[PDB]
């Protein structure tokens, strides 16, 4: 017997390979990403993490993109520009998935997009998972 797991742990598309879709994290108090590949890669592909906030004309539409700030850990290096990023290694196999999440919330919406759109950035798929609804 399986369950309707989507009731408790819904997931939403964040990057389908041609467009980036803002995702709402307001009602969920935890979340994370998930990465997968569909073809052999030619080089590393980095990503940028953004966050949005309520637009002026309507409280249910996101505003312009705001780049996320970095948060150094207990003790360790910090990014050269103070902004969070994710780098997908070239060695990643087609039959594997990668998981990682940011430590801080910031605005009630989140987004992600590649640093440069090209034939290599279309070979990745990013999905966001939630947990712990608060309403």
């Amino acid at each position: 017997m399986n369950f309707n797991v989507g009731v408790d742990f819904p997931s939403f598309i964040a990057w389908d390979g041609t467009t980036s879709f803002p995702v709402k994290i307001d009602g969920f108090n935890q979340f994370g990403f998930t990465f997968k590949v569909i073809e052999e890669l030619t080089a590393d592909v980095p990503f940028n993490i953004f966050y949005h906030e309520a637009s002026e004309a309507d409280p249910c539409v996101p505003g312009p993109a705001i780049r996320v700030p970095d948060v150094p850990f207990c003790d360790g290096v910090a990014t050269a520009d103070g902004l969070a990023t994710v780098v997908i290694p070239e060695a990643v196999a087609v039959d594997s998935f990668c998981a990682g999440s940011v430590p801080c919330f910031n605005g009630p919406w989140i987004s992600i997009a590649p640093v440069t759109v090209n034939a290599d950035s279309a070979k990745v798929q990013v999905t966001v998972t939630m947990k712990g609804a608060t309403r």
């Binding site: 990023t85 994710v86 196999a93 039959d95 594997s96 990668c98 998981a99 990682g100 940011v102």
Partner: peptide
Amino acid sequence: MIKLNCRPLCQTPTASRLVSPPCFICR
């Protein structure tokens, strides 16, 4: 700089031949 947690989904079988000494020769 986020650090990813990776692991594969599929298991690939392995077929390794075992080889044994091929009899003696005068050398």
